[PDB]
Structure 1
Amino acid sequence: FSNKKFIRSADDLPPSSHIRPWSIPELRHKSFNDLHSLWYNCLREQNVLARENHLLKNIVGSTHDEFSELSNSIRTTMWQIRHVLNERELAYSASREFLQDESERKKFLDTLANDYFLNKDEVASMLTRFQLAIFGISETVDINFIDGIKFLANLKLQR
């Protein structure tokens, strides 16, 4: 239910001008856990509306459809969320593929080295972020981790 009401009146409902569904871009910069929570809130809202909508259609035989419109809107937001979740995974996969191509990865490493590392006019913080980003090294063991260690050692030697 919503505020323990058998049915939300027109005044109890959120008006159409005040309410908007989520934008895909807005969703795109939200964390996974947050997105998951949002989805479940949406689902809960739909359930509340679905109960109410059913009552309206089955018993009173209305064609007022505000609840239905709300449910549709929520459904739109949900699929947008689903899309952004898929899209993020795809983007990650593409990045992985790009990194797997060796020359490109080497070029990227060189670029990283040139601008921000080994320069003056923070570094440790960058390294710790870079470590997490590119290799499996937080503060467990693998070929990638080893490679990252070697790279770090090389950087230290340079500096």
Structure 2
Amino acid sequence: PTTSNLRCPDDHPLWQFFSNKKFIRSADDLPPSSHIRPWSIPELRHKSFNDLHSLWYNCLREQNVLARENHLLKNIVGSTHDEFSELSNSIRTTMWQIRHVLNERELAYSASREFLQDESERKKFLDTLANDYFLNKDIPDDEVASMLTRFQLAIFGIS
């Protein structure tokens, strides 16, 4: 059987397991450790759920590429360079930081709800929010509408 009979697409989804369609990356092709750093918890604290989700899957795809390269390295040539391994470890660090952030975000939301279940704190919070900006001495006129829209969207389910 001859391979001349095949039209292999250059955009075949199996190329996503390689970087720049390279069988195995060289030290020059790998990202130098000096210029690279894993994500920080505070930087992931203010990334939307979509952003964290997409970053998770990008991390997983890169880890898959590194995994195949590392398997070829440690199974066939049996070298002890351990570069792909630490690079994937950095990615894994970012991943568990993301997991931590998501958990803490949900727990903080739940704690806020439980705090505002209490009638006393709810009354205090609404009274302060009404006295501070709402019912001002006629200084703000138009932006009060934006404040009210945000209020009805946040404290209640009004869209």
Alignment TM-score, normalising by the size of structure 2: 0.85
Q: Secondary structure at the match of 1:118?
A: coil
| Structure of greater relative contact order (alpha carbons < 8 Å, 6+ residues apart) | 2
Distance 2:61 2:130 in 1: 49
Bigger CA drift: 26-35 or 115-124? 115-124
Report percent identity of matched pairs: 100
After superposition, the CA RMSD in angstroms is: 1.1
The structure richer in helix per residue is 1
Q: Secondary structure at the match of 2:39?
A: coil
Q: Secondary structure at the match of 1:136?
A: coil
User: Which stretches of structure 1, 4 residues or more, deviate above 3 A after TM superposition?
Assistant: none
Matching of residue 6 in structure 1 with residue 23 in structure 2:
yes
Distance 1:40 1:118 in 2: 48
Instruction: Give the corresponding residue for 2:158.
Output: 137
Distance 1:131 1:8 in 2: 54
Residue deviations 1:17-65 (CA, integer Å, cap 9, x gap): 0000000000000000010000000000000000101000000001101
> How much has 1:97 moved relative to structure 2?
0.1
Q: Secondary structure at the match of 1:57?
A: helix
Matching of residue 51 in structure 1 with residue 56 in structure 2:
no
> How much has 1:116 moved relative to structure 2?
1.1
> How much has 1:110 moved relative to structure 2?
0.5
Alignment TM-score, normalising by the size of structure 1: 0.85
Residue deviations 1:54-93 (CA, integer Å, cap 9, x gap): 0000000011011000000000000000000000000000
Residue deviations 1:76-132 (CA, integer Å, cap 9, x gap): 000000000000000000000001011101100001001111114910000101111
Matching of residue 27 in structure 1 with residue 44 in structure 2:
yes
Structure 2, unmatched stretches of 5+, are 1-17
